[PDB]
Amino acid sequence: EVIAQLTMIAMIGIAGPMIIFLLAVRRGNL
């Protein structure tokens, strides 16, 4: 169960900074 938990929170945790990064490279409306 602990490998699954750490993978979920890793994917969830990257999602936020991933949004900022994608908008930064696309010169979006940050």
Add this chain to the structure above:
Amino acid sequence: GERPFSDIITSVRYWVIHSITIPALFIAGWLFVSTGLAYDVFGTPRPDSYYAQEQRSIPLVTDRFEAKQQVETFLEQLK
């Protein structure tokens, strides 16, 4: 007169160097414990080494000048 830290830690050269040295130091510290070496350098009891199996008394040092030999005696009584 030296470069600002923000210039250094946002440079590629800084991270090429430290992508190696920081993990290497972390792993060496890990191994210092996982090999058990930390116990023997500092003289810290392992979990099975606080008490002998029969006695439940603390190996307290009571002799100032033969304390070194007194610790050495308390340790031989474990195994």
Add this chain to the structure above:
Amino acid sequence: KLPEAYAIFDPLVDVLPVIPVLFLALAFVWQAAVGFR
């Protein structure tokens, strides 16, 4: 326990409660990316 059909999603359910905390953290990532202007 969850109903058994949902059991495979147990590790996901374990982590969802902390997501609101991530939104507060995300505000600082975002502010850093615009230089705290």
Add this chain to the structure above:
Amino acid sequence: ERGWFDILDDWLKRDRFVFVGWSGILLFPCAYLALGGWLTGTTFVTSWYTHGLASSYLEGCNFLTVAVSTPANSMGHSLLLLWGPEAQGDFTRWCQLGGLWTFIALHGAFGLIGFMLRQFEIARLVGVRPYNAIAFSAPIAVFVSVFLIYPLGQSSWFFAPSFGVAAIFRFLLFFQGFHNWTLNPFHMMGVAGVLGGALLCAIHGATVENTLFQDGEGASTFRAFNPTQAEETYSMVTANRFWSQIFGIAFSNKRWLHFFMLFVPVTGLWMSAIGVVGLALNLRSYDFISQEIRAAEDPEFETFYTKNLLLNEGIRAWMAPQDQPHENFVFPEEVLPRGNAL
């Protein structure tokens, strides 16, 4: 042709990111070893042979319970040098005997000397009066009285404070139970100086921040200040009127205000150091003799003073066997003082 001393003086006093100075030759090694010794000991080193205690991350303690603990009482006030007659050059035995405690205390003492010297040296080079150094005499008086004079008056370093969070809390409660230290007027003056200093810190910062002149258009007002400006950034006149009408009195002299902010906490810490020097000798403010005469003769007479002594008696009887293991105390259940039911 200048002379090596002046050439060294030049290099030591170069304006660099970390100022060195002559004082740094003492300060940096001693501060680094004191800090490094504490981190080393709290991470890896036990207190099993000196105290019967686990005290390191390696043993399972956390940040609140790790410590570098004092040597065993049987060491007396030994300097406990690595090459001394107790450890005889054996680093492992030295750690097991508590040598890291005197290592940290003594490098710490000389590091504090180095820091105060740094305060003098930088003040002299920049051309300011050395009041920061003078204010630092209070931390020094506290460290010297608590970590050096107090154990030197007692039986051994064992009864000095151990360097740890929970270890220090134990030291507080020991001083309550054995010294009745809260009853000591030198501690009370110390408390007044610390709480009074924190009061002055808060009220002065709040007063400045709420008597600012509007020197810009922003709703966030920090940007409307220039370090080179000649003008006061807040109104002393409006601040004075406010506190005069709220509290009855107010500062009117900015120089006195800022000297008083130094005087209060510095004097308080100095007074607490004097009381601890007395406690080095068990010269306690333990009792009020008139209270004890009355209570001994009159079993209906009770005050908060007699109530706290009963607590002290509980602390001593219930903590001493494990806290003073060299004494080999065995207190049979029937002799332990305790109230009803508990």
Add this chain to the structure above:
Amino acid sequence: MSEGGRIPLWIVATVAGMGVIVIVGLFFYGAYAGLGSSL
């Protein structure tokens, strides 16, 4: 190679902070498992 700002400071701060969170989280996990867990 030595030019400042090739790696944006906001990314440095985010990754470094996540590293701090991971290591501190590991220490809190260790409060409940193995030595020091009371178990």
Add this chain to the structure above:
Amino acid sequence: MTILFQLALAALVILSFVMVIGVPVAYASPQDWDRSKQLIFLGSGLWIALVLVVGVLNFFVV
């Protein structure tokens, strides 16, 4: 049916993760807003449908 139910819920989880990232990016992106707006509609309708599918299918495995 138990596996089919698990598939529809897995699809909803995956679609959700795609929307959580894709919608703020699209909303704040200058170009391709016309294509983004249509996709956000499609994702939203599919999301709602999958919630209903999982909701109905729940009662065949619980």
Add this chain to the structure above:
Amino acid sequence: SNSIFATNRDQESSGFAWWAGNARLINLSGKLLGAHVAHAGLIVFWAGAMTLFELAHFIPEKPMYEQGLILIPHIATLGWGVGPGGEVVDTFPFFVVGVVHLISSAVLGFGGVYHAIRGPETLEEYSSFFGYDWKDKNKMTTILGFHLIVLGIGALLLVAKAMFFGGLYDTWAPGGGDVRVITNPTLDPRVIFGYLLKSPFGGEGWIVSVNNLEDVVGGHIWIGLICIAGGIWHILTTPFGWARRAFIWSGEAYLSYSLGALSMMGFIATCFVWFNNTVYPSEFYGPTGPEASQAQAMTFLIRDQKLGANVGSAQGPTGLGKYLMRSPTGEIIFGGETMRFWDFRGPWLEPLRGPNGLDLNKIKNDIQPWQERRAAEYMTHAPLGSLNSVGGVATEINSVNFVSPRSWLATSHFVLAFFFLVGHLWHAGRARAAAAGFEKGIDRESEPVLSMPSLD
């Protein structure tokens, strides 16, 4: 174009630094709408996700209060999922509440993100209905009225649950705690508003003393109609002159008023969960502090009486009864330190109480095993424990993983109520200073004190 300062989202345009950045929204109704709806999504998200976490961790045969649960207790108190004595008979209602909140949070988050970054930044150009000016007193009272009506409907939903959709869990139900349909809600205003005029001190307890579901339901009938009526009132009127002259009329002032209101409610909730065992049933939340202390005295009374003690005549060391004594007004109460808790009332104890207080005849003859069980359970689940959830007094050794839900809920909401009172003071003082035009500091060329006579 390619400029970092080119947007209005910086200190240069707004006058507010990044750490006060949400103040840049005061006069941007569209984006501020987004912020509020997104934040509502976060609340709803937590309710849903936390319930599913609780349910996934839930062992239905252990008491809830042994399991760190705070949301499932709220659902169970509404009568969902439980039977006699609070036993869990069906976890599916807990699952439904969790799922539906979690799904709903996606809709709120969608609308929040839309309004916050994609939709119109200000609403006034787009809609006279949804646009607003903080200084438009009539628009402000209209939006207040809409939300008052929404709140009144919410109160009537509780009533609907209690009277027409299964009832509520009643710890006081005759024969033992059980779900019960409320058919005769208390409508008499002398009772309903009598609660509001009770002293908050001991033995009275203001509204925290509500001790039966008929008063609870009837009270929510009253609050429902009052809120709907007040909402209609505020849609059809504008503030009277005396109100106009008394208040500050600005977004920040309105925020400060609500912060003072929420602080007060937070302190009230703290006392409710600490003392009240009717709308916070001890079956779900654990015993209250007073309850567990009373349960200890009850436990040793039972034990010692079984051994042959005459508990009525047993003089304790002080001269007061070791087990039983009188309150300052004469009622027979439990002795020892729990003399302070004699205002406690609970269903396991009331069968032993008569007109004079605890009845020695009933104590000698009528204590049932279920009462001994309940008192032992509650004595050993007293709401005492460490921050790392080691149950018991502070000197307890590690073993029991327990902190009462009552302690978690009381402490959190005191912390929150306290900072919200600080926020009230902050924003109330700032709103006054900003309305008067000196929130940025003293005008050097027009310093008021310089125009005042000296004090002396």
Add this chain to the structure above:
Amino acid sequence: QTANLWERFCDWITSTENRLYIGWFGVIMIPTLLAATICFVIAFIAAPPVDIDGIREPVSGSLLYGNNIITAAVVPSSNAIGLHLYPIWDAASLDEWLYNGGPYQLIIFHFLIGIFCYMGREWELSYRLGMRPWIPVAFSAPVAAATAVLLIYPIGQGSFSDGLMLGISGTFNFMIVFQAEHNILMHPFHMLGVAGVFGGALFAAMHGSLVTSSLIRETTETESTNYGYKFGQEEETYNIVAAHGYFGRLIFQYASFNNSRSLHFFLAAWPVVGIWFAALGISTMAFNLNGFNFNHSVVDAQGNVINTWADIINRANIGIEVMHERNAHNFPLDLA
């Protein structure tokens, strides 16, 4: 006219010319603080012994009944009263009211109303003077702490007999019992409190010494340097660039404040937030969410407990626990 005479009254109440500002908060503050002060002074000198723990064991608090300044206190109301309000008129006599600790309730309730109004009065005068409004936010920290020990803690424990006792030794009694019953030393909010007051004292000495260090020479060698500043002068009296140049070299440059507004905000915020957390410590231990418990947390391979310093603290806590209120407990757990 009624409206004119009332407006004259309002103008006097809110006048910026009164030597001490009155104001609307002052209309409540002045009578409540006077009642609390007068009762406290009389009780501290002359009150007879009070049965704080409701076990007919009266504790003498007043000077005339055998106390000195260090041991005297106004003793809390009886444990038999609990949280009941006990005004004079609910007593059969002043004699009864005194035995049962009536004065304590009168004092603390008037005092608490008074200091809350003192806080509002700080807002009010700042508004009349055209000042910024957050001095009462700083004062809310000591107010919160006083409210924690006089009101919240007794509510949580069910009795004003457990609130702070109003005297020097009574304060120490409160502290020592609190440590046994909550392990407050191991609670992180008390730790933040200590950082607040240690740090506040440190930063006071630091700020005081740095400004004093860089005063501009304006006096002769005879007179006090204090004469170099004149009340209300426009120019700054010290060289903040010199002060910053010293402190930036003492540590490193970027660790030092050159912005005086940032500096003084920090001086306000550090002790205030620290004391907010201290007050929240007491106010949440009031509901028995207590300090960290690592009692027997370290165990060896066989299962023997290996003591830590936390366990030595526990032994002191037990000694306090078993001795305190030695005649008041009949049953094995102290549950409040």
